[PDB]
Amino acid sequence: EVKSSLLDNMIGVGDTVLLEPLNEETFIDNLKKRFDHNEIYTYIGSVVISVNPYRSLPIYSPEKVEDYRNRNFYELSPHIFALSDEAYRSLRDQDKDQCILITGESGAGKTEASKLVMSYVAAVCGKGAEVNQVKEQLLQSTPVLEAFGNAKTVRNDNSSRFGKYMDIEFDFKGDPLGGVISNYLLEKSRVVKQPRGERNFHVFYQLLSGASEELLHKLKLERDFSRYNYLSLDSAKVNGVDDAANFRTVRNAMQIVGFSDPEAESVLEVVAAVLKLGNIEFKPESRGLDESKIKDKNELKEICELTSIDQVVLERAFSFRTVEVSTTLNVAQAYYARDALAKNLYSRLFSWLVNRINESIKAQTKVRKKVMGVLDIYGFEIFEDNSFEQFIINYCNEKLQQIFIELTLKEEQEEYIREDIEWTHIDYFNNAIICDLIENNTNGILAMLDEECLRPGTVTDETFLEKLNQVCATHQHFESRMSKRFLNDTTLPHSCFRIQHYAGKVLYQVEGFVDKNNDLLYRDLSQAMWKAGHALIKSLFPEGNPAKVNLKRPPTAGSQFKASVATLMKNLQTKNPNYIRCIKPNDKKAAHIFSESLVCHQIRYLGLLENVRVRRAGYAFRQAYEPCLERYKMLCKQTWPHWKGPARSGVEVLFNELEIPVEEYSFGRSKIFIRNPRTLFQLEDLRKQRLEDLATLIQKIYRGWKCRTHFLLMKGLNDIF
């Protein structure tokens, strides 16, 4: 055991539940006060707040990985090793599965946090070398995941447009067997359309940049971003990004992950089909009620030569639809399919790549396995121009927070009953009204956006918004130009709606919501692609097998996510969760700069102040009667040195001695509860000033014994009479 406390030599305040007053002012000024002392980790109860130092700090020492070994939170200063410890001990002793949820803006260190969690675990789990046979494949795999899943937005030059899960698998003894990597919620829309200033995924620009002309001639490509629609002319070269170099780094990484050069070559063929697949244009057939028709077949011809598919079947695919018969598609309906084939060929390949990596470190043996995992989902996004893409990222952050704010509230209420303490209803922010506003299947935005895409009639963005305005109007968390806030703000213009999240109000632009929501992969495309000669392309499209049931598809795009976010919340609940809130102090990757402006935004995004109100829950401090006495018994002259035993009554008579009012605390069946920190800081101050009297006692007594001993010895040597 050990008799320590994080209140000792506390810089600022370590567990922000001891904050008083609790405003955003005092919060920003405390992760700055700590930050300046290299105290980047801060607690909200069992949660760690990680502000990126943008340097190496000497707190990741081997002596820490052991100092934080098998110790509770309060026993030491805040550190990420306290979360990794709770996780490992829970994994080890309860045979539980651990998910570690990392949230925040890119560059906040979410890549670094996961590496410090798993590098702690290797150090304490005994079989560290075998664990790190896994952390290396997961590393060497990063530059591929990035090329296919990261992209340059108007605020992040390397943002991950997907949810990232990785874990390491042990058996019920502690012997590691392998790892997994999972991909979630890919922004398939980014393939086909992007906004201005932003950029498509990396792998397109890495390929065209650093593929030798010989390699660009096997794929019917050319170094000219101005020739491709799915790529952008101006926004295609980023500051300090050498896609040529990155491509050599993605070509290497596949080699060491385990890709036969046929496999790799057949991967870069599919990036080449999808890039060139957005060059296909269509025009009406002799056309007010008529059909669609290609413009050119040259790029289509190249796609067929490359993919080994049959032009006749794609020609027929992009234009007809055999169902139930073979209805012909409108021109719009035909572009929607040239895209749907593009994004549902990129995503199916990215997910393919992920499961081609996991074959390496899949756990061979079929025995029960515990899991030590990290979920790095993508940070909240308030852009200047918010679109359908951000809607998902923010709806995903709202599902995760509601799931968390209620779990946290449930477990605090579950403790106040163990100690026979009364509950006080926390007038908090139930996050569910925004979820309901979004994901409801009757009056939802998703359902009513899908419902405008199921119309054979003519539907544009302004009908979907003027649908929202009709039914979403009275929802106090929905405000538009014709719906109706009572605040003196300039009126909203057309073609936008604003809703209130847990992270604040976000203004969404409707241009694209209908196009970005049409993900219609009708069977004629899966079937024409199952007829390919490409061992890869035919493997991504199994519904193209005529044998397989012709059932349906995921009818919509917003539907395809509401189900994909559902399987995530359902997997994450089956696990023991801990959380890391990663924060950037400066946009400029600077070491010791802390901008109160930029950090406060993330305090909103991460929803941190509700965590404090939720975890405070009235009484902010609690401690078991035993250590609470051994620590403060020296403050009255009735407990010093003993006792009063037992501890509940010794503490009672201690407080009724310091004249501290009875309204300021409460007696639990094992722990003493204190409402406001301003009391606990009064006890921890008196202790600071009592210990200055204990030191003075030892000091005064060593000085007396040293002098009395120096004197009698001296006057014992007076025997020279």
Partner: protein, 145 residues
């Protein structure tokens, strides 16, 4: 009227003398804590500085023997336990083993209270043996008596 007794008054001069070197007949300010402590006294340097500011308005450091006596008469009633000084250490113990880290002793004895000097805490240490220090063996040492 001190209130004190002669056999005491015997004990104290023995000690008073050898600090009184000049024959001018007094111990210096700085000569009072070492003669106090030399006969069963454990006074805080603050208490000592109080005493000084009381006697000496003569602008020099001089103390007579009766005022000395009446500076020693109350302090005998100033008992100081042993389970106190034993707990004062246990407060500064990472574990409950009774072994205190020699550094966390130097830290305390040099950062809290009446700071001890660099040479005090070194020789305190070399009297307390051996990377650690058995503060429970150190207290009997200083309190056997």
């Amino acid at each position: 009227a001190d209130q004190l007794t002669e056999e005491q008054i015997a004990e104290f001069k023995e000690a008073f003398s050898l600090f009184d070197k000049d024959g001018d007949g007094t111990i210096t300010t700085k000569e009072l804590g070492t003669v106090m402590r030399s006969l069963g006294q454990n006074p805080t340097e603050a208490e000592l500085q109080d005493m000084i500011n009381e006697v000496d308005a003569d602008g020099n450091g001089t103390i007579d023997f009766p005022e000395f006596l009446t500076m020693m008469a109350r302090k005998m009633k100033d008992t100081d336990s042993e389970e106190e000084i034993r707990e004062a250490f246990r407060v500064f113990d990472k574990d409950g083993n009774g072994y205190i880290s020699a550094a966390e002793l130097r830290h305390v004895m040099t950062n809290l209270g009446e700071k001890l000097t660099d040479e005090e805490v070194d020789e305190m240490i070399r009297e307390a043996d051996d990377g650690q220090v058995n503060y429970e063996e150190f207290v009997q040492m200083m309190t056997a008596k």
